[PDB]
Amino acid sequence: MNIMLTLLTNVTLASLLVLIAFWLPQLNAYSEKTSPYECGFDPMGSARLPFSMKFFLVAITFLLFDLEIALLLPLPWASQTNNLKTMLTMALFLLILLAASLAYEWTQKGLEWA
Amino acid sequence: HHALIPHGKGGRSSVSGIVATVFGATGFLGRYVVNHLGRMGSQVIVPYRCEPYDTMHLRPMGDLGQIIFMEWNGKDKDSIRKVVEHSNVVINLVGREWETKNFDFEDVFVKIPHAIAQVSKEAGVEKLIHISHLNADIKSPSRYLRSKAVGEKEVRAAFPEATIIKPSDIFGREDRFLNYFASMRWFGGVPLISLGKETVKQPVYIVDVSKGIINAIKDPDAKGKTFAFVGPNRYLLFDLVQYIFAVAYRPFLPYPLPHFAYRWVGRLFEVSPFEPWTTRDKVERVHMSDMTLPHLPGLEDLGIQATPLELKAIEVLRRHRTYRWLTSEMEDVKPAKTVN
Numbered sequence: 001m002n003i004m005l006t007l008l009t010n011v012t013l014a015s016l017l018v019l020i021a022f023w024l025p026q027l028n029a030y031s032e033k034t035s036p037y038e039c040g041f042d043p044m045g046s047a048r049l050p051f052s053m054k055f056f057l058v059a060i061t062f063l064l065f066d067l068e069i070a071l072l073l074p075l076p077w078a079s080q081t082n083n084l085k086t087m088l089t090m091a092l093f094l095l096i097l098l099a100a101s102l103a104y105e106w107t108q109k110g111l112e113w114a
Numbered sequence: 115h116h117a118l119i120p121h122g123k124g125g126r127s128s129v130s131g132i133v134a135t136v137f138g139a140t141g142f143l144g145r146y147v148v149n150h151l152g153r154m155g156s157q158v159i160v161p162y163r164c165e166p167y168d169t170m171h172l173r174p175m176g177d178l179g180q181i182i183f184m185e186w187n188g189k190d191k192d193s194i195r196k197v198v199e200h201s202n203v204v205i206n207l208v209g210r211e212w213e214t215k216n217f218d219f220e221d222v223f224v225k226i227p228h229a230i231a232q233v234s235k236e237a238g239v240e241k242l243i244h245i246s247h248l249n250a251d252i253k254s255p256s257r258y259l260r261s262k263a264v265g266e267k268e269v270r271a272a273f274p275e276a277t278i279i280k281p282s283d284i285f286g287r288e289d290r291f292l293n294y295f296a297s298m299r300w301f302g303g304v305p306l307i308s309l310g311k312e313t314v315k316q317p318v319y320i321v322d323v324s325k326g327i328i329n330a331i332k333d334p335d336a337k338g339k340t341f342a343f344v345g346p347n348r349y350l351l352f353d354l355v356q357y358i359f360a361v362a363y364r365p366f367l368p369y370p371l372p373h374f375a376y377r378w379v380g381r382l383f384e385v386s387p388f389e390p391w392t393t394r395d396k397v398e399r400v401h402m403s404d405m406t407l408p409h410l411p412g413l414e415d416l417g418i419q420a421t422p423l424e425l426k427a428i429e430v431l432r433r434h435r436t437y438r439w440l441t442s443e444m445e446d447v448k449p450a451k452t453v454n
């Protein structure tokens with residue numbers, strides 16, 4: 001419950017800072033001031049228009065790489081087993097497969113953008 | 115004695131001979147009165163009791179040396195003397211919608227007007243433009259309108275040839291009428307006495323009021339006349355607020371609040387030492403229906419045709435819309451029903 005207390009205190013402190021920020025200063029708002037910033041000129045299109053990702057494949061593969069990182073996390077405890085041969089072979093197998101996937105993506109020009 | 119021949123083309127660098135002392139120019143109407151005076155090439159003198167920073171927005175309104183800033187004290191006639199000494203026109207716009215610690219409705223709508231009018235006679239000022247309120251009654255439910263009536267008589271006593279203007283409910287970009295209703299969304303619903311079915315209001319555009327004041331100065335017959343500045347349409351309070359929440363694209367939730375409860379709510383918001391969000395007099399004035407005075411000249415007599423609220427309401431309430439309804443035009447919302 002101590003971690004919950006710490007989280008609550010941090011969140012409350014941050015929200016109190018927000019409250020003081022939004023209620024201490026003298027506020028004078030008008031349409032021009034709150035307009036979006038586009039380096040002094042009016043924006044052409046909406047900022048909510050599609051924004052193409054030139055590294056989409058990199059992200060989709062980062063998904064599986066994060067999966068492999070999740071698979072590799074139990075390794076510090078896995079070294080405490082009596083079957084060190086099998087454990088080591090399986091860990092090196094997972095790492096080799098990760099390297100092979102990275103190599104396949106690299107050679108087939110997947111890490112490149114556009 | 116201070117008579118100036120106009121020169122130029124009426125532009126920014128011209129001479130108009132309209133040297134004026136606009137009291138309370140640091141306010142909604144003041145900005146427009148100064149800007150109209152400044153663009154013609156008039157020597158505008160701006161007294162101020164606030165921090166020079168708050169007067170900064172008035173600086174670009176006139177050419178070099180055409181906008182003079184000098185401090186004044188409402189309780190010191192000597193400070194009034196040095197600011198109206200060389201002015202051929204004096205305009206009084208000093209007025210607060212809420213009683214302060216050191217200034218009460220009597221002090222701002224009776225004492226100061228009288229002091230300005232009295233001193234102006236001493237200095238020889240030719241024309242004075244006093245700004246009262248359409249619903250100024252000696253027995254009005256609101257102290258604000260009560261003092262606004264007492265001061266009106268005192269100005270005529272101190273300054274017999276003074277033009278008195280009684281605007282209805284000026285609306286504009288920095289207004290406390292259209293923005294007032296649009297800001298009620300934060301409190302959930304829209305509390306209206308009798309659901310706003312027993313109040314008729316005739317708001318006036320800020321530009322029309324300012325141009326009326328300028329035309330009153332230019333007009334040689336406005337001396338001693340009492341004008342009433344009103345809009346071209348009369349609206350029910352419920353219909354007007356619904357239209358306000360219509361062009362603002364906000365969910366309109368009107369619930370009837372009894373008069374005693376609404377007055378109690380107004381008292382709660384008076385506690386704030388800063389500018390109150392609402393006041394008991396503010397509640398009474400809003401609920402009070404606008405008077406009709408067909409025996410007084412209006413904007414039409416001064417050559418300015420009143421602009422309908424429908425045309426100039428999008429400007430005020432566009433900032434109150436969300437991102438979804440920012441780019442919507444001013445024609446999608448249909449005009450509200452007018453009681454004409």
Ligand SMILES: NC(=O)C1=CN([C@@H]2O[C@H](COP(=O)(O)OP(=O)(O)OC[C@H]3O[C@@H](n4cnc5c(N)ncnc54)[C@H](OP(=O)(O)O)[C@@H]3O)[C@@H](O)[C@H]2O)C=CC1
Pocket residue numbers: 137138139140141142143144162163164188206207208209210211217222245246247248280281282283284285291
């Ligand atoms: N819809 C409306 O607003 C209507 C208003 N009127 C009246 O016409 C005038 C229009 O002014 P408006 O645009 O509303 O002004 P604001 O309410 O926006 O600002 C008030 C102005 O008066 C000055 N002022 C107020 N009280 C004092 C004081 N005690 N001593 C010195 N200066 C003071 C302020 O100077 P500072 O900012 O430094 O305090 C400021 O320049 C007012 O007299 C108003 O009551 C009449 C009909 C309708």
